[PDB]
């Protein structure tokens, strides 16, 4: 199966946050580390995305844009999966060196959001998602958020997204039951991602006030791209309404 071969071959490996675990659970220390981990994972998301089947069919500005818009959901989805598979969703496995318990959930001031993500992670267990389903779904998530006014060359995108949906079908192949649920799980990512976007944006704006450091790419993306989403110029593609 050429398609699954590729996804498996390009899947990023382990990414560490560089968190000081020997040190008090500070709000600023935890979030400075999430922000650094965000940067690290975005580099991996870029190298992954560029390697995906058909990705170069897209106009290079649409290439950049779809990564930037999708980055948060892709991270949310991969993290739920790591959480599921390392700790059976008992805690949130952001990275080997940044595993969130309830206490950290609370101290990060992201408890409500962390609760959503753990519930997503429990879903991977409740539905018996396979590693290959995971991989297909994550690739499709990359093509699941676009400007309401469309992309620069929309037709190439429509075709790519179309082929990623079909590859999800193939792997599924009750089927209709499977596809309903997996498409539902995929839609469930977007409102988490949206709460994460909001939190990240607010934190950026109040970050000098709270001594939270934002790396370069994070400040740029959260100030230039994320407000497109939060202002409604850019929206997720939902399978179900919503």
């Amino acid at each position: 199966p050429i398609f699954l071969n590729v996804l498996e071959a390009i899947e990023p490996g382990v990414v560490c946050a560089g968190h000081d675990n020997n040190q008090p659970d500070s709000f600023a220390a935890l979030l400075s580390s999430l922000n650094e981990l965000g940067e690290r994972q975005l580099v991996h998301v870029v190298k992954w995305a560029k390697a995906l089947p058909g990705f170069r069919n897209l106009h290079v500005d649409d290439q950049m844009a779809v990564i930037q818009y999708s980055w948060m959901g892709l991270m949310v989805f991969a993290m739920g999966w790591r959480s599921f598979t390392n700790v059976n969703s008992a805690m949130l496995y952001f990275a080997p060196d940044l595993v969130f318990n309830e206490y950290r959930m609370h101290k990060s001031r992201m408890y409500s959001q962390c609760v959503r993500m753990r519930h997503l992670s429990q879903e991977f267990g409740w539905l018996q998602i396979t590693p290959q389903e995971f991989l297909c779904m994550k690739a499709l998530l990359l093509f699941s958020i676009i400007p309401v006014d469309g992309l620069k060359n929309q037709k190439f995108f429509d075709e790519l997204r179309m082929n990623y949906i079909k590859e999800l079908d193939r792997i599924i192949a009750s089927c209709s039951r499977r596809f309903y649920q997996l498409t539902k799980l995929l839609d469930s990512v977007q409102p988490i991602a949206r709460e994460l976007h909001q939190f990240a944006f607010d934190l950026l704006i109040k970050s000098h006030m709270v001594s939270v450091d934002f790396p370069e790419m994070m400040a740029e993306i959260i100030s230039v791209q994320v407000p497109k989403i939060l202002s409604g110029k850019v929206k997720p593609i939902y399978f179900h309404t919503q």
Partner: peptide
């Protein structure tokens, strides 16, 4: 900006 530079590698 920074992202396009990253993307460019």
């Amino acid at each position: 900006g920074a992202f396009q530079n990253l993307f460019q590698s």
